[PDB]
Design a protein around this ligand. Structure first.
Ligand SMILES: C=C(F)[C@](C)(CCC=C(C)C)OP(=O)(O)OP(=O)(O)O
Ligand SMILES: C=C(F)[C@](C)(CCC=C(C)C)OP(=O)(O)OP(=O)(O)O
Ligand SMILES: [Mn+2]
Ligand SMILES: [Mn+2]
Ligand SMILES: [Mn+2]
Ligand SMILES: [Mn+2]
Ligand SMILES: [Mn+2]
Ligand SMILES: [Mn+2]
Lengths: 543, 543
C-alpha cells in the first residue's frame, strides 16, 4: 500500500554513541598543546626562507591546526605576496620556479590574494605552450597541477597548466619519476586536488605522511597528533547532544520509513564547520540534517501527492493551528520542525539579540516547496530536462537551508541587508549547493531513480542529448568544475557580504559532498570507505 | 523607575546542583528493596490483628513506601471495611474503642471508603457530648483528633470530636512527661494534622520516630530508609533536567528582576507528584513553576501597565509574530514560554498521541489575564473586596496552570469531555488552588504588599471589616479549613472524571503549600527552615 524506499539501521547505536568518552576532554592536553603551539609558532615565524614557510603553512593547514596559526598564516603570506610583488599583472619574468611559484600562487590565492594568471608565463615556450623542460620536475609539476585549481573562467593559462602537468604526473605515476611514496601523494592529489579536498576528515593520513617525512619536525607533529585528538573529543561531545535531540524526536520508531543516520548527519558538519569554535552550529546541523533527511524521505519515498500537497501548504503558511489536519506522521514531523526552528531562533535571540524565526521558518518553506515540485513531476510521471531539473535541483538538496541556518550561527553580527541578500539565496549559496547537489546526484542517481524518484542530472542529461551514462557522468563532472570556478571567484570576492567563516562553510560544504559522494551515499545505504572515514575521525584516536 | 522587588539568589549554585550523585541511582539498590518489599509485603498480608495491620498501613505510608503496597492497602482496608460493616447506616451499640475506630475511620475515609460520621456516636454521653471517661485514652484520643480532619460541612460529630480531643491533647502536652515522645508526636499532629501533612518531604522524621518504636520491625525499617535514598537519587536526577533547562533560558542574566529559585521550584513537586512514576511531570513542573515565577515577577514587580497590557494581549492572541513589538525582556519570556508548551505538547503528542498545545496555551493565557487584573487594580490604586479578590486570587496564584499541566502528564488517557471539565476549572482544581492561595497569602501577606502588590486575603479582610490581622489570620485559617472540606468530598467523589493520581497531586499541592508557607515564604525569595527540609529531602542521605 505504501512505498518505503528500503533503508538500513544506523550502523552506530546509542550505547556506543551515548557512552563515548575520550580522555582528551581534559585541560592537561589542551594546555600542553596550547604551549606546544607557541613553539610551532615561533618555529614558523622565526624561519627565514619564504618557501620554507609556504611549505609549513600548507602542512600545518592540511593537518587541522589551521585554527591556531591564523594571523601567522596571514602576515607570512601577506608579506611574501608583496615582497615578491605578486600584486602585478605585468610579469617581471624573473624566470621563477614551477614549484615555489605554483605554491606561493596556490596559498596566496587560496587566502584571497590577487595573483595574475600571467605569473605562470615565464614557464612557457614560444608557441605559448608550457615549456618542454618542465617535463623534468615531478615535484614542482605536482605543485602546478594543484594550483591550476584556484582558477576562474577566463583563465586559460591555469586551465592548460593543469592539463600539462597532468599527462605528465599520471604517466610518471605509471613509471615513477622518483620515490614510490610520491607515486601515491601524487596520485592522491591526482584523485582529488587539495583545493577540492576537505581538511578535517583528511588530516590523519596527512599527519601520517608527515610524521614519516625525514625533514619532519616533532613539535609540530606532536602538536598535530595532540590537537587532532583534542578535537575528536569535541566532536564526541557535540555528537551526543545532537544524539540526545534525535532520540527525543522518536522518529526512529515513530517515523521508520525515514533514514536512520544521525552520526552520518552530524559527521557532515565535521567537514563543513572546520572552525572548532562553532560547536553550536555543528550540533544544530546534526539536527538540521537529520530533519531534512526525514522530510526528504517523507517526500520522495513515503508520503502521497495529497499528503504532500497539504504538508507542503501547512508548512508554507506555518499553520501549527491545523497541525491536526495532517496524517499523524506529518504532525509529529512538523511539530518537530516548529520545535527546532523555535528553539534555534531562541538561542540566536538569546545570544545575538534577533528574532530570526521568520527567516529560518522561510528556509524550510522553500525547501519543502522544492521537494514538492520534484514530487509533482515524479507522480505526474514528468520528465524534466537537465536545465529544468537543475534549477530546482540546487534548492531541493537543501544547501540553501543548511547554509542559511549556519549563517546566523557562524556570523556574530548580521545586518538585514546581508540576511536579505543571503536569502535571495546568494550566488555563493547557489554555487555551493550546486556542488553538493551534482556530487550527490553523481553517487546517488542509481537506486535514487531506480527505487522511485524523479530523474537526476545523469538521467536528465542522458535523455536530453540522448547519450550514455558515461557521457552524462562526464558532463556532470564538468559542470562541477564550472561551478567551482564561479565559487572561487565568489569566495574571494570583495563585495561579498559574508564573513570569512561563513563563506568558509559554503566552500567546505562543496568539498564535503565531494568526499561523501566520492563513492556511494554515506547516507541512504552508506559506503565502507565513508564508514571508515567516520569511525576514524569521530571514534578512533591517533598515535 | 522599574520597582524590582529586590530579591535574593538561589542558595544553591551551578556546580553543586550540576554535580551531586547519590549512588542509589545504582540498580543494585532497587533489587535489595525489591526483596525487602516482598518481605514487608508478607508481614503485612500475613498479619491477623486488623488493628495491627491498619497500624502498619499507616506507617508504610507516613514513611513513604506507599508506592509498592497499593494493592495491599486496597485488599486490606477493603476487607476490614466489609467485615466490620462500615457500609451499614449505623452499628453504634457502645462496643467501639476510640483508637482502633478513630484510626480505621481515617484510613478507610482517606482511601475513599464511605463511612458514616455516626460511628463516633457510640462515644458520646447523655446530653450527646463525647464521653468524659475517654478523657483518659490519650492514645486513641489522638487517633480521633486525627480522623476529625476527614470531614465535610454536614458532619458535626467529627467537628466536635476535634473540638474535644484537642481540649485534652492540648493539655496532655503540659503534663509531666508521658513518653515525652508522645508529647512531641502529639504536639506534632497538633501543628498540622496528618491529613494536611505531605508525606514525601516528611518521611525522614517519621522514619526516625519509627526506628525507636520498640514495637518495630527491621525489614520494614530497612526497606524504609533504603527507598528514601533510592528515591532521593531520582529527584537529584530530575532536578538537573529542570536545572539544565533553567540555565539554558538564561533568565538569570536576562530577566534578573525575576526570582532565582529553580531548586525550590523543582522541590515543590517532590511533594505534589508523589508517585515516583511521574518523573517527567515532576521534571516538567520544575520548569512550569519556574516560568510562572518569572512571568509573575514581571507582573507584580518589574513591568509597567503598558508593558503588561500588551504582554497580556499578545499571550492571549498568542502570536509569535507580533513578538517583535514586545519589550525585549518580554520577547525572551514569551518565546521560552512558547517553546515550553510547544516542547511539552510534543512529548505528550508523542507518547500519548494528542495535540495539547491549544489547551496548554490556554492555561497560560488565563493565568496572565488573571495576573493582569491584579496589575490593573494595583496601578489603578484600587482596593478590592475580600471576595472580589478571592475570586481572582485562586486563579492568579497559578494553581489551575500548575494542575491543568499536570493532568496531562499524569493521566494515561483522557477525553475532550474530561479535558473540558477540567478546564472550566473543575472544583477539584478550584479547591486545591484556594488552599495553595490562602496558605501563600498567610506567609506572604504583610511582606509582599509592603513593597508593591495588590492587597492579599489578609489585608482585604482587614479593611473589609476593618479588623485586626489576627482576625484576618483567624479568618483566612478558618477559610482554609472550609475549602479542605469541599476538597475532601471532591477527591473521594465517585463522580470525579479525574483519575486517582491526578486527584492526588491536586490534594498534595494543597498540602505542600501548607508546608512551604508554614514558617515564612517557603517557595523561594527567602525560606527559613524551609531550606533544611529541602537540603534534607534533596541532598542529605538517610541512615
Ligand atoms: C541527506 C543526504 F545525504 C541527501 C543528499 C539529502 C541532502 C541532505 C544532506 C546531505 C544532509 O540525500 P538524498 O540525495 O537522497 O536527497 P535528494 O532526494 O535531494 O537526492
Ligand atoms: C510559589 C508561589 F505560590 C508563587 C506564585 C510563585 C510560583 C510558585 C509555584 C508554582 C510553586 O509565588 P508568590 O506567592 O510570590 O506569587 P504571588 O505574587 O501571586 O503571591
Ligand atoms: Mn528528494
Ligand atoms: Mn531522496
Ligand atoms: Mn540523491
Ligand atoms: Mn502576582
Ligand atoms: Mn508575587
Ligand atoms: Mn504571595
Amino acid at each position: 500500500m505504501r512505498r518505503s524506499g528500503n533503508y538500513n539501521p544506523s550502523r552506530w547505536d546509542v550505547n556506543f554513541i551515548q557512552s563515548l568518552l575520550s580522555d582528551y576532554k581534559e585541560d592537561k592536553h589542551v594546555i600542553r598543546a596550547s604551549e606546544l603551539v607557541t613553539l610551532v609558532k615561533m618555529e614558523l615565524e622565526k624561519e627565514t626562507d619564504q618557501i620554507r614557510q609556504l611549505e609549513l603553512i600548507d602542512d600545518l593547514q592540511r593537518m587541522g591546526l589551521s585554527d591556531h596559526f591564523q594571523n601567522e598564516f596571514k602576515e607570512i603570506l601577506s608579506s611574501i605576496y608583496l615582497d615578491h610583488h605578486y600584486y602585478k599583472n605585468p610579469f617581471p619574468k624573473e624566470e621563477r620556479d614551477l614549484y615555489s611559484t605554483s605554491l606561493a600562487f596556490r596559498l596566496l590565492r587560496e587566502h584571497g590574494f590577487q595573483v595574475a594568471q600571467e605569473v605562470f608565463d615565464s614557464f612557457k615556450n614560444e608557441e605559448g605552450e608550457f615549456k618542454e623542460s618542465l617535463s623534468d620536475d615531478t615535484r614542482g609539476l605536482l605543485q602546478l597541477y594543484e594550483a591550476s585549481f584556484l582558477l576562474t573562467e577566463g583563465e586559460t593559462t591555469l586551465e592548460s597548466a593543469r592539463e600539462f602537468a597532468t599527462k605528465f604526473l599520471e604517466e610518471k605515476v605509471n613509471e615513477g619519476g622518483v620515490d614510490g611514496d610520491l607515486l601515491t601523494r601524487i596520485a592522491y592529489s591526482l584523485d582529488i586536488p587539495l583545493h577540492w579536498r576537505i581538511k578535517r576528515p583528511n588530516a590523519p593520513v596527512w599527519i601520517e605522511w608527515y610524521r614519516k617525512r625525514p625533514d619532519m619536525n616533532p613539535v609540530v607533529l606532536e602538536l598535530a597528533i595532540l590537537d587532532l585528538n583534542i578535537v575528536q573529543a569535541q566532536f564526541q561531545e557535540e555528537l551526543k547532544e545532537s544524539f540526545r535531540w534525535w532520540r527525543n524526536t522518536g522518529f526512529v520508531e515513530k517515523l521508520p520509513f525515514a533514514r536512520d543516520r544521525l552520526v552520518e548527519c552530524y559527521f557532515w558538519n565535521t567537514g563543513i564547520i572546520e572552525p572548532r569554535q562553532h560547536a553550536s552550529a555543528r550540533i544544530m546541523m546534526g539536527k538540521v540534517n537529520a530533519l531534512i533527511t526525514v522530510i526528504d524521505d517523507i517526500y520522495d519515498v513515503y508520503g502521497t501527492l495529497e499528503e504532500l500537497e497539504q504538508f507542503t501548504d501547512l508548512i508554507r503558511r506555518w499553520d501549527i493551528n491545523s497541525i491536526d489536519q495532517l496524517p499523524d506522521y506529518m504532525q509529529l514531523c512538523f511539530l518537530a520542525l516548529n520545535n527546532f526552528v523555535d528553539d534555534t531562533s531562541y538561542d540566536v535571540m538569546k545570544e545575538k539579540g534577533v528574532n530570526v524565526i521568520p527567516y529560518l521558518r522561510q528556509s524550510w518553506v522553500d525547501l519543502a516547496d522544492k521537494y514538492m515540485v520534484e514530487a509533482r513531476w515524479f507522480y505526474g510521471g514528468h520528465k524534466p530536462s537537465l536545465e529544468e531539473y537543475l534549477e530546482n535541483s540546487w534548492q531541493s538538496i537543501s544547501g540553501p537551508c543548511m547554509l542559511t541556518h549556519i549563517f546566523f550561527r557562524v556570523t556574530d553580527s548580521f545586518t538585514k541587508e546581508t540576511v536579505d541578500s543571503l536569502y535571495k539565496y546568494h550566488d555563493l549559496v547557489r554555487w555551493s549547493s550546486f556542488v553538493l547537489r551534482l556530487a550527490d546526484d553523481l553517487g546517488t542517481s542509481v537506486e535514487e531513480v531506480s527505487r522511485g524518484d524523479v530523474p537526476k542530472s545523469l538521467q536528465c542529461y542522458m535523455s536530453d542529448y540522448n547519450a550514455s551514462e558515461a557521457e552524462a557522468r562526464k558532463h556532470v563532472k564538468w559542470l562541477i568544475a564550472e561551478v567551482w570556478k564561479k565559487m572561487n571567484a565568489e569566495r574571494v570576492s570583495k563585495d561579498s557580504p559574508f564573513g570569512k567563516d561563513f563563506i568558509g562553510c559554503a566552500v567546505d560544504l562543496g568539498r564535503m559532498a565531494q568526499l561523501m559522494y566520492h563513492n556511494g551515499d554515506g547516507h541512504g545505504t552508506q559506503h565502507p570507505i565513508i564508514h571508515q572515514q567516520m569511525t576514524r575521525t569521530l571514534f578512533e584516536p591517533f598515535a
